[PDB]
Design a binder for these strands. Structure first.
Ligand SMILES: [Mn+2]
Ligand SMILES: [Mn+2]
Ligand SMILES: [Mn+2]
Ligand SMILES: [Mn+2]
Ligand SMILES: [Mn+2]
Ligand SMILES: [Mn+2]
Ligand SMILES: [Mn+2]
Ligand SMILES: [Mn+2]
Ligand SMILES: [Mn+2]
Lengths: 244, 238
DNA sequence: AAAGAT
DNA sequence: ATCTT
DNA sequence: AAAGAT
DNA sequence: ATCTT
């Protein structure tokens, strides 16, 4: 399928190639700095040609947001299936020690999931799938050789601020958790688990409808959530009682 | 001086090189996308070698945050004068024309000496902003090899760069809401280079943003702009 | 612009 | 967009 | 974690 | 970190 070919290609490219810097048209290379700020940009750019190639092999049109602040990173679809669009959003996080538990921020819970056309490239109801390509890497402190530029002939002598990159492709609802991913910017939080749990889809929601109802009615602060629900057990009790 | 040699190197480097992609150890190049995040990241990386080269010429050590979400992008200090650090932070914005930058929070280190800052705020003697401005600009969804560098399309054109003191270019209207950022003046590139700001002093700039309330409701009984802040001062800070 | 989006 | 305390 | 930092 | 509505 489009999905299995896509993760096979991302998994393969990740295994083979390592990104090591930004290059100028003049051929000068600038090394990579430390944060997920830098790495999240790098893994998203790494992913673009792969996603396009597989999408094309399958007959899909690939569209990135023409406007800033709009989800998703990539919209895929066949002209013949306008209402079966696929959203793919790339998310990244890090670990300090290889293999510990990780969590991702999955985007807002008060934009398009509550307003069909808010901050999304096509109306929400035109999408039938929302996939997350998740990247995890282990941090490696920057070295005092990262601060010089390099020429192409030194490509593999460039130090990297990361190691152990892993990648997965999973449905957003499947890896969504029940605790916010951020406060002031109201993000859905994924489960906090091991990389394999994301691959296997060991999340907390039983269905995509449950994930949506939960996040569509999740209040913004602990105060606002006090008489409602703050986690999945509380939400299921709240559902049991009649949404009260 | 360190400042003048840095302005000169930044201008020069920006003039000589145009960043066009990320490269893998295997030599494959991936083009740049248009997300805001992309340009912010690229200009910061681009500045790193320039800043370290000039700092070392001047005897300054350069330290980047060892912890994420901490200001500033670069901390400079001569070993002998540790209590005299220089903060340099990179900011970016776009054009198609007046521009404005978000200059960082007004509720972190300016209100709490050790909050989200690498070294105590009182150890810094200067806070500089390196501002990058560019003009925003297809199936650039494929990889390239070294022989094709010159054909890779870019999501930008006309990059300009300046270095100015943060207080000098700071404005009186928030640069963001929920992430409570100081907004810079809304002016032309030339005004940033020339330092044509609104605050009469660094003291005024800091006091203003240290007492700016977070919402209009709160601000409308105190101050919403520099004129109202000056009147608040006259009323006795109430 | 203020407020809230990625 | 994701991270710290 | 929640809340608020870059 | 900075953008949109
Ligand atoms: Mn993106
Ligand atoms: Mn993304
Ligand atoms: Mn953890
Ligand atoms: Mn919109
Ligand atoms: Mn596990
Ligand atoms: Mn930075
Ligand atoms: Mn910066
Ligand atoms: Mn700290
Ligand atoms: Mn002007």
């Amino acid at each position: 399928s489009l999905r299995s070919d896509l993760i096979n290609a991302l998994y393969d490219e990740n295994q083979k190639y390592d990104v090591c810097g930004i290059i100028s048209a003049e051929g000068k290379i600038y090394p990579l700095g430390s944060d997920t700020a830098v790495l999240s940009t790098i893994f998203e750019l790494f992913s673009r040609p792969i996603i396009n190639k597989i999408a094309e092999k399958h007959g899909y049109i690939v569209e990135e947001p023409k406007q800033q602040n709009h989800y998703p990173d990539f919209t895929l679809y066949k002209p013949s299936e306008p209402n079966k669009k696929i959203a793919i959003d790339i998310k990244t996080t890090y670990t300090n020690k290889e293999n510990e538990k990780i969590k991702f921020t999955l985007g807002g819970y008060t934009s398009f999931i509550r307003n069909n056309t808010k901050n999304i490239v096509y109306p929400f109801d035109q999408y039938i799938a929302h996939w997350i390509i998740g990247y995890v890497y282990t941090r490696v402190a920057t070295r005092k050789s990262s601060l010089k530029t390099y020429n192409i002939n030194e490509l593999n002598e460039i130090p990297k601020p990361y190691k152990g990159v892993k990648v997965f492709l999973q449905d957003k609802w499947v890896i969504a958790g029940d605790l916010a991913g951020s406060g002031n910017t109201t993000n859905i939080g994924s489960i906090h688990a091991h990389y394999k749990d994301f691959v296997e889809g060991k999340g907390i929601f039983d269905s995509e409808d449950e994930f949506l109802d939960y996040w569509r009615n999740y209040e913004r602060t602990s105060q606002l959530r006090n008489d409602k629900y703050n986690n999945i057990s509380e939400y299921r009790n709240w559902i049991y009682r009649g949404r009260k």
